[PDB]
A paper describes a structure:
By homology, E88 acts as a nucleophile, forming a glycosidic bond with the donor substrate. Our data show that CtNDTE88A is catalytic inactive, as expected, but CtNDTE88Q retains some catalytic activity, albeit the catalytic efficiency in comparison to the wild type is reduced by almost 50-fold. We used the inactive mutant CtNDTE88A to isolate the substrate binding step, the less active mutants CtNDTE88Q and CtNDTD62N to determine the involvement of each of these residues in binding and/or 2′-deoxyribosylation, and a wild-type enzyme to obtain boundaries for the magnitude of the rate constant for the 2′-deoxyribosylation reaction. Stopped-flow data were used with enzyme variants CtNDTE88A to estimate the rates of 2′-deoxyadenosine binding and release, wild-type CtNDT to obtain the rate of 2′-deoxyribosylation, and CtNDTD62N to obtain the rate of 2′-deoxyribosyl hydrolysis.
Nucleoside 2′-deoxyribosyltransferase (dNDT) enzymes catalyze transglycosylation via a covalent 2′-deoxyribosylated enzyme intermediate with retention of configuration, having applications in the biocatalytic synthesis of 2′-deoxynucleoside analogues in a single step. The reaction catalyzed by dNDT proceeds via a ping-pong mechanism, with the formation of a 2′-deoxyribosyl-enzyme intermediate covalently linked to an active-site glutamate.13 Transglycosylation occurs in a stereospecific manner, preserving the anomeric carbon in the β configuration in the newly formed 2′-deoxyribonucleoside. As with other NDT enzymes, the active site of CtNDT is formed by residues from two monomers, and therefore, it is only fully formed in the dimer/tetramer.
Numbering used by the authors:
A (entry chain B), D (entry chain C): 1 to 154
B (entry chain D): 3 to 154
C (entry chain A): 2 to 152
């Protein structure tokens, strides 16, 4: 009955249009699985951007959310994936959080032939079956055959 | 010897690997640091096997876990994603953090720092600049955090 | 003849961005009387099962830039998209009208005068280039900016 | 062999170490073919960077060099290739300059399966034989079986 907490890491807060139009459908798909979504652009609405220390406070606030999530859902679109998202993904791998990756961007940005992206993004995923954690469309988030659903049900 | 994980995108180009990395390695070794540079350290991995990518990732993860600090080359627009994953690991594991950027361009989401604020989450609010190196010649500096960290 | 805008963007690469972000921009331009040439839609006819599809898309995009009246370049991202940048360089060298769009508040710059790499502004005047630089979809139809005046 | 003019577009001037160590070998490889190299970071050292209009002056100078060159030699390393290089490449394609591409970066940043990079970089290259204009190592620049050399001897 306690909802699992997902940190929703994305570059979508940087573009006015992307923040308005791309994130809400992703948040809704995750919430339809029963997830408690911590999305940092929304959770940092409160922070007083008129202070000189706002960037440091956002950094610490995001760090605490990653430490206290149960898993990360990392939007890794872009060439290359966003550096903020990557730092958060690294934190979550090191803290043994559950890892889920989302990329509906069909371009390749890779240093290898096994994975569609730089191999470091998959260090927290299994050698076999990592594709089950790798979502390629918003429509796929609901899938009972993929790893987010299975994680929530055991 | 304190151990530094030297994260960089410099293994990706023939020239960068042979020309850019050794000067940085030498500058760190001249401080008495044992340098763990992943492109060199994973040279014994068999790149004819399908699982080589997985083994590099696991080896890199273990080196981050076992290092004492990360020295992260964060050049580029934006910084390299593999360097960033490694930086994130190091922050979460409470490793010492040192950043290197001799790229004068800005790739930032704020005005306080020259780069995305998440890179500085493992550095102090005041004096983070002491951990931020902007030239190979500055690495040896007695007044910057790497030296103080070794002699502290 | 309606004026023709080549709408260059990285938005066709992401399924969601293609669906949600491009139609509002197309509509804002068309509401000004513009005929919009958006290459991901214009190249939909190409047979992507054939090995020459990438060459045919490149030549189609090149011809569209040659035949447009101006480019409206979505230069979001860190850095701006390389496909959009090649089209922009083409448009600049061909004396097409240049309009830039960035609603990404991040900075990817090599100078202090402009918010982006200085080469993106090579086709814009020294004074008043900000009039050609759009930072929101709402601002596209500003009767005070360069697109409206150009029309 | 003719002494043709090559605009050497690269991102290497942005990093102190790369400007010092990566750019001169490429300049020398081109000069070793008898080419007159126009390298913009060096060519704009004349400009007064204490004036507010220095960025405008560098852009116009670069634009003029692309107009007046015979070909571009574009260093298209990085994920993605550098945006200033890409604008210059676009200018050169539309001005029917000769086009030569250099990438010794072994990562892929591509939107297709025919080319190793975004297809727009190859719009001014032939459908068949574009590989002869595509260089993947400094040592290869001198090859008389590739298009730079043959362009000089025609």
């Amino acid at each position: 009955m306690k909802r699992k907490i997902i940190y929703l890491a994305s570059p979508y807060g940087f573009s006015q249009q992307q923040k308005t139009l791309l994130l809400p459908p992703i948040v809704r798909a995750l919430e339809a699985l029963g997830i408690e979504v911590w999305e940092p652009f929304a959770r940092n609405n409160q922070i007083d951007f008129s202070q000189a220390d706002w960037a440091y406070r956002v950094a610490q606030a995001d760090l605490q959310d990653v430490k206290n999530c149960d898993g990360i859902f990392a939007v890794v679109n872009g060439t290359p994936p966003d550096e903020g998202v990557m730092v958060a993904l690294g934190m979550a791998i090191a803290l043994n959080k559950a890892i889920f990756l989302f990329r509906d961007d069909f371009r390749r940005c890779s240093d290898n032939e096994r994975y569609p992206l730089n191999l470091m993004l998959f260090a927290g995923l299994p050698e076999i079956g990592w594709e089950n954690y790798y979502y390629t469309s918003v429509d796929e988030i609901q899938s009972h055959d993929k790893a987010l659903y299975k994680w929530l049900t055991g």
